[model samples]
Target: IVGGYTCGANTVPYQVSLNSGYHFCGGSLINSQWVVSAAHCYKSGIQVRLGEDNINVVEGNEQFISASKSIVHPSYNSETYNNDIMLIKLKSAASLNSRVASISLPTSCASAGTQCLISGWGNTKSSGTSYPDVLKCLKAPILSDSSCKSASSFIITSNMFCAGYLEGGKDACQGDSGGPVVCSGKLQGIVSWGSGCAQKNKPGIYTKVCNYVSWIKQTIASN
Candidate 1:
């Protein structure tokens, strides 16, 4: 998280750490049994830690669960980052409480310029190699589609959207992928990729969550 600050413990209860042996990415609990994250964050050793704000120490509320299965979007493009979303099913459902909860999904598309909140335990800066033990939070506005197309060198598909500062002061950097982008108290996006963390004119890209709502529900039902 470029230009982000520490989030209050349990403030974002839906946020979870995606651990592939260790903390590698972030995720949002959308249901007791399902978590939404970036498709690229998926790995064989993936497990999830919920009710956790700090990754280094174990808290009484913290619940670690093995991933029963992971379903990456069928059309995910590693190059373009199109359909860069995934679902992870936990071996057992998470027990919701003040320290653990699920976020609501967006009913409609997120409007351009909407200010959203992103939280994760990723790098604090672009040049930083260390990942934060505590979750960090940043507020960024959703960019216009035209601006996103102009900002990125690669194709910015409709399935993806942009957010953050155009001058590159704020963004979701490495290790932040698969985190939640919440707007209007709803989960509107998922941290996907960026051209280098918080670079000038290169806002962070995200998977438009509204576009995959149907697929998410269907996948969970079928699985």
Candidate 2:
């Protein structure tokens, strides 16, 4: 999700720009041919941009690829925002290098108090109208499920988790949906939704990647 400060070039290489005619959301490269994103970010005419830093200009290492197909979780609940995850199949595989690569999936669930990072081109602040031209990142602390459930205005499901500060200064803002939540060098969650960007005590919600590992693997293997 969009938040905090700018990221150095090649800092989060797996980060992807999900464009639908234009920049729409953020995603993470899981492999050369697949990208993981938020189901609610689904849109027609989607494309993927890898190895890019500035969204306004094409970098020398950037790879622009068309999205061949996309699949949203069958059980995804748009209303309650449950199961807000999806995958995109690239028409061609990405070439791995220093500026282009994939992030590893979580081998275990994220524990409370774990430090995580979120990167995206989303708005700088909740009330901000403009998105950053370059990728921005923020550090967030994962909150316990119980704390999230009690604090969030929305329903917190088992398939979902929360992260961010209790204070109203840092958060993933709008246009950051589908971005990666990296914890300990592993991809742990996908930015889903939140009450308001960085609102006090209302942390950003994310789709728990550990809970859908099997489903993600099966879907990729079959497709």
Candidate 3:
């Protein structure tokens, strides 16, 4: 996360690291068996690191679980990055403790100007590759759809939202996609994409979590 600080241990217990030998993306524990990530981050043989703080250091609280199944929204548009959310069913249920737990889904959509917290191991630099070992985080305000469309050249669909400063310099960056965008003590969005890493007038785009809450619940139950 560019222009962010290291998160306190257990501060974001729901956060998880997606690994295929190395940390590639971030995910949020939805339940003992489900993890929420971006459809774009999917891969074969992905391992989940729950209760993790520092990726480099092997902390005893970590749970290394494999994906038993994955469900991306059937209407997900990869090219446009719409409906970018994905769910990973873990091979085994994660044990809940002080260092690990599932976050509650959003009760409702977050309003524009709501200050939100995002956590991930995305690059600390806006440019180049500088993945942080520890989880990084920052606060960004959610922008209205109209504002987002104005700032972003691309079409900002209702299924997506934007967060960050118009001045830039603070945001979730490369390798951070699929991390938590928490607001109102709930998981509100998933880091999806952006025009660039914290560029001026270019807020970080996210998969609108509220739009898929029902779909998520149904997917978990039916799949």
Name the best candidate (by lDDT). 3
Order the candidates by TM-score, highest first: 3, 1, 2
Encode model 1's per-residue lDDT on 110-212: one tens digit a residue. 8998999998988877775778888899999999989778867657788988999988888998888899999999999999987889888888889999999
Give candidate 1's error at residue 62 in angstroms: 0.4
Candidate 2 lDDT tens digits, 66-161: 999999999999898899999999999999998999999988999999999998988886665777888898999889988777776567789888
lDDT of 3: 0.91
Model 3 lDDT per residue over 1-223, tens place? 8898989876899999999999999999989999999999989999999999889898788999999998888888999999999999999999999899999999799999999999998889877778778889899999988877877776888899999988889988888999999998899999999977888988899999999999999889897
Winner by TM-score: 3
| TM-score of model 1 (CA atoms) | 0.97
- Pick by TM-score: 1 or 3, better one: 3
Q: Rate the local accuracy (lDDT) of all candidates.
A: 0.90, 0.88, 0.91
RMSD of each candidate relative to the true structure: 1.1, 1.2, 1.0
Tell me the number of clashing residue pairs for each predicted model: 1, 0, 0
Q: Which ten residues in a row have the lowest lDDT in candidate 3?
A: 145-154
Question: Which model is ahead, 2 or 3, in terms of TM-score?
Answer: 3
Residue 131, candidate 3: C-alpha displacement in angstroms: 1.4
Better of 1 and 3 by lDDT: 3
